[PDB]
Swiss-Prot record, chain D:
The keyword Metal-binding does not apply. GO terms for cellular component: cytoplasm; cytosol; cytosolic small ribosomal subunit. Keywords: Ribonucleoprotein, Ribosomal protein, RNA-binding, rRNA-binding, tRNA-binding. It holds the Pfam family Ribosomal_S19. Part of the 30S ribosomal subunit. Binds S13 and L5 and cross-links to the A site tRNA. NCBIfam families: rpsS_bact (TIGR01050). This is Small ribosomal subunit protein uS19. Belongs to the universal ribosomal protein uS19 family. It comes from Escherichia coli (strain K12). InterPro entries: Ribosomal_uS19, Ribosomal_uS19_bac-type, Ribosomal_uS19_CS, Ribosomal_uS19_SF. PANTHER family: RIBOSOMAL PROTEIN S19P FAMILY MEMBER, SMALL RIBOSOMAL SUBUNIT PROTEIN US19M.
From Swiss-Prot, chain E:
Coiled coil: none annotated. One of its GO terms (molecular function) is rRNA binding. Part of the 30S ribosomal subunit. Contacts proteins S9 and S11. Cross-links to IF3 and the P and E site tRNAs. It comes from the Bacteria. One of the primary rRNA binding proteins, it binds directly to 16S rRNA where it nucleates assembly of the head domain of the 30S subunit. Is located at the subunit interface close to the decoding center, where it has been shown to contact mRNA. Has been shown to contact tRNA in both the P and E sites; it probably blocks exit of the E site tRNA. Protein S7 is also a translational repressor protein; it regulates the expression of the str operon members to different degrees by binding to its mRNA. This is Small ribosomal subunit protein uS7. It comes from Escherichia coli (strain K12). Signal peptide: none annotated. Keywords: Ribonucleoprotein, Ribosomal protein, RNA-binding, rRNA-binding, tRNA-binding. The strain K12 sequence is shown. Has been predicted to contact the N-terminal domain of IF-3 based on footprint studies; exactly how IF-3 interacts with the 30S subunit is controversial. Belongs to the universal ribosomal protein uS7 family. The chain holds residues 2 to 152 of 179 of the full protein. The gene is rpsG. One of its GO terms (cellular component) is cytosolic small ribosomal subunit. One of its GO terms (biological process) is cytoplasmic translation.
Length: 127, 114, 100, 80, 151, 98
RNA sequence: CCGGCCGGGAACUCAAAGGAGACUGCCAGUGAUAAACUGGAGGAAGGUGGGGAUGACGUCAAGUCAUCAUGGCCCUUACGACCAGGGCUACACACGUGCUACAAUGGCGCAUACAAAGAGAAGCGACCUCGCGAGAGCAAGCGGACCUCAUAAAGUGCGUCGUAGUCCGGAUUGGAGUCUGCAACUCGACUCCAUGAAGUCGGAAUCGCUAGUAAUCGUGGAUCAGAAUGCCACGGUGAAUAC
């Protein structure tokens, strides 16, 4: 019935269900336009779909938890590509050719003792 | 227009035009306008004399420019001639709230002089 | 650390559980909106008659093995140096070196 | 005692000492080591002596000095 | 560096035009790492650039850039009691990302009201071959001829 | 109807106690929910390394507190009698709420 | 009563136990046919994938006799011990590490999305009422994936301020207060009203940073009755450049 993908970009884990039909996307019981608002957050969701040009073919039910704006928006882009990974099989090579499949494991690193912020040392004056 | 001491600034919002009165800041200026029935967005220039007339008497409920400076100078004089601690700090021109004078307190002491 | 100072801490402990576990009404019970006559003024006056040793205000909370006033740790009860001397040897259970 | 809910403060030893003085009025200066106590209007006209750390200096009471704590009128550290 | 040669990162295109060249422009203009207001200025000045003069919005950008790209720049090497600035040709990849830095910096000194108005005014000036960005480009070009005896 | 939550400073030791408790529950015959791992608590400390200055050099420690829960549901009269002092492990907290 | 709210399900995010994975493993080329190097496929990850812990023989007779122990030397009706007050916070000046700004990619007002980590028993303290506010009163819940701290902020939408020492800046000062605490003057934090200083991008010189980095925005904890712009830790947005 349904097909699934997770997405886990930068401490925000999503979950996407892809339904054949028309083109409508509901995320966390809200519409796509009103949840994000940022033009770099409602196209990055769309980027996997426009590349395969299905866009108007799939009905999406989405719940996203944790993270921020671009973290969640990036996470969805991961899950959608993973959702598309399931119910079609010959599409992997093209989808991977534009990213969307690499998890992009870049997290915030430690503060570190002796360092002021995370890599910045305090000002060093010799005398 | 013309309030207790003087109200020079036209072309400014009324809520922020009365702030030029020595004793009216922002929370009181907001209060006085509401008490007199005048909104905040309305400019002082647009105000017909049927409004500023009530403004020249509303400020009489708060001590203002005409007397506020006399009281503060009297307030400081009482401590200065008393001989108490805060009088001594005023006498020498040093901080009176008990803070650092070892390095800071340029505002109270004055410009950096060797 | 200067055994004189160590004896102060237990003298102030002894007078801390002796009074301010029972003679707390004056500073807690008779402080609020109630009969506003001199009985409250008696409570304020009578609280000073007790010795200077109050419960929180005069406890330095020093280490248990050396009596070091500074660097205390409330959880282990030792200073910041005895914790590493009651060490990674294994005296403290489940306390290993952290790396995250 | 730094709140109206608690009430103005004076030490018990000072409070009983001043009560005896007013019973006989002005007398020899009162020597006291208390500096944390407010000034009550019952000791106007006395010349109590506070201890700044090395010596007892006599502070003359006046109606104006009725809300300030006793130590205010004894400079504890000298300078020039 | 000195040991490891390395390539460059991948830039996501802008959400309104899909051009990477303007995707870097919102990056250069951005301060404190807030692309939200950084992109808000860029399109605002890009829109009023199209209506004022020229056609399109992604085309009036490329015409302007042609008048601020430096062909040759001077690099200084230390020899003796002084230094000689020896000219050297600039590779195209540096050339684009250098002109944009000149445009933004010159458009932060404008006397206009908001950055939206300043950026569009300077961009229109570039296409008309005037302004303070093209002022720098000519100077970098002029210095090359002065020190072309040291080439 | 009775919850047994187990706390310990090492996972291998806490598994020794939770393994017998289901076995005892299996010995009661049936109806065990199965141990569930609750989130772990980790306290991190940072003490200075020297008796003196060089504040910039420190040591960071951490104590973990592993968690388990078995959630016994059917209280047989022989379940209560047999579930006292049969942990066969030292240094493991036990807490039973009715 | 569209509140996971209720039966209910073990799929999904997640929790925590155990495994699989990455090894120049495979292909082409260069290489003294070798070590290895440059690329290609697959892969979530590609050449020690990112970070941490880990610091050889020794140097500075570097620091600590004030964490502690100890060789000597010394006071031992004292250089030991107890107590009240004061000082460690003093100020013609100089240096170091930081916070706040000097504004329009901002100030203020209204409305509204999205976190992670962490703490709690003479402790964290909902709810409701009161107070312009710090906060006060009664006062549930929780030694805790449930109860509290705890409304995250930068952002987004709307409105105004039009380049002024300004609706920027918040020091200083007068008055009025709240909470700990025997006790707030010396010398606490915080709140209300008024005042509004220097500051309009900083001389010589000099510091940090190569990617979730710098920059920028907020939350937590240790110490702690009260008292950090410091210290330690977490996440959100997120660069430029390496010839
Ligand atoms: Mg950060
Ligand atoms: Mg204390
Ligand atoms: Mg916890
Ligand atoms: Mg190693
Ligand atoms: Mg003493
Ligand atoms: Mg000091
Ligand atoms: Mg000036
Ligand atoms: Mg505290």
């Amino acid at each position: 019935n349904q097909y699934y993908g997770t997405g886990r970009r930068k401490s925000s884990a999503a979950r996407v269900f892809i339904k054949p039909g028309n083109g409508k996307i509901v995320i966390n019981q809200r519409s796509l336009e009103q949840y994000f608002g940022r033009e770099t957050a409602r196209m990055v969701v769309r980027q996997p779909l426009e590349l395969v040009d299905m866009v108007e073919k799939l009905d999406l039910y989405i719940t996203v938890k944790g993270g921020g704006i671009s973290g969640q928006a990036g996470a969805i882009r991961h899950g959608i590509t993973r959702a598309l990974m399931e119910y079609d099989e010959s599409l992997r090579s093209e989808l991977r050719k534009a990213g969307f499949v690499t998890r992009d494991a870049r997290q915030v690193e430690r503060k570190k003792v002796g360092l002021r912020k995370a890599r910045r040392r305090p000002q060093f004056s010799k005398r | 227009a013309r309030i207790a001491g003087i109200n020079i600034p036209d072309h400014k919002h009324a809520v922020i035009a009365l702030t030029s009165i020595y004793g009216v800041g922002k929370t009181r200026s907001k209060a006085i306008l509401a008490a007199a029935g005048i909104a905040e967005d309305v400019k002082i220039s647009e105000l017909s004399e049927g409004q500023i007339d009530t403004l020249r008497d509303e400020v009489a409920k708060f001590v203002v420019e005409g007397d506020l400076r006399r009281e503060i100078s009297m307030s400081i004089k009482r401590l200065m001639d008393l001989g108490c601690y805060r009088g001594l700090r005023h006498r020498r021109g040093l901080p009176v709230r008990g803070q650092r004078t070892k390095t800071n307190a340029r505002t109270r002491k004055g410009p950096r002089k060797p | 650390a200067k055994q004189s100072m160590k004896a102060r801490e237990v003298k102030r402990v002894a007078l801390a559980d002796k009074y301010f576990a029972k003679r707390a009404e004056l500073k807690a019970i008779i402080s609020d909106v109630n009969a506003s006559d001199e009985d409250r003024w008696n409570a304020v006056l009578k609280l000073q008659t007790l010795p200077r040793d109050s419960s929180p205000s005069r406890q330095r909370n020093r280490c248990r093995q050396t009596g070091r006033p500074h660097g205390f740790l409330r959880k282990f009860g030792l200073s910041r140096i005895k914790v590493r001397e009651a060490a990674m040897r294994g005296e403290i259970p489940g306390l290993k070196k952290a790396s995250w | 005692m730094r709140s109206l809910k608690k009430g103005p403060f004076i030490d018990l030893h000072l409070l009983k000492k001043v009560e005896k003085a007013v019973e006989s009025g002005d007398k020899k200066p009162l020597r006291t080591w208390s500096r944390r106590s407010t000034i009550f209007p019952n000791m106007i006209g006395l010349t109590i002596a506070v201890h700044n750390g090395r010596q007892h200096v006599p502070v003359f009471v006046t109606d104006e000095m009725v809300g300030h704590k006793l130590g205010e009128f004894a400079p504890t550290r000298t300078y020039r | 560096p000195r040991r490891r040669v390395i390539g460059q990162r991948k830039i996501l295109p802008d959400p309104k035009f899909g051009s990477e060249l303007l995707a870097k422009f919102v990056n250069i203009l951005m301060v404190d790492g807030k692309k939200s207001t950084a992109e808000s200025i860029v399109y605002s000045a890009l829109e009023t650039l199209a209506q004022r003069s020229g056609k399109s919005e992604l085309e009036a950008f490329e015409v302007a850039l042609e008048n601020v790209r430096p062909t040759v720049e001077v690099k200084s090497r230390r020899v003796g009691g002084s230094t000689y600035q020896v000219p050297v040709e600039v590779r195209p990849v540096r050339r684009n990302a250098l002109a944009m830095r000149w445009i933004v910096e010159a458009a932060r000194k404008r006397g206009d009201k908001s950055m939206a108005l300043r950026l569009a005014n300077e961009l229109s000036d570039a296409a008309e071959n005037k302004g303070t960005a093209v002022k720098k480009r000519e100077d970098v070009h002029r210095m090359a001829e002065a020190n072309k005896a040291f080439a | 109807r009775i919850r047994i939550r187990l706390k310990a400073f090492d996972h291998r030791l806490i598994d020794q106690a939770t393994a017998e408790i289901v076995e005892t529950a299996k010995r009661t015959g049936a109806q065990v929910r199965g141990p569930i791992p609750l989130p772990t608590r980790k306290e991190r400390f940072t003490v200075l390394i020297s008796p003196h200055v060089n504040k910039d050099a420190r040591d960071q420690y951490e104590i973990r507190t592993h968690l388990r829960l078995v959630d016994i549901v059917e209280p047989t009269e022989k379940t209560v009698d047999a579930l006292m002092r049969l942990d066969l492990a030292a240094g493991v907290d036990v807490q039973i709420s009715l």
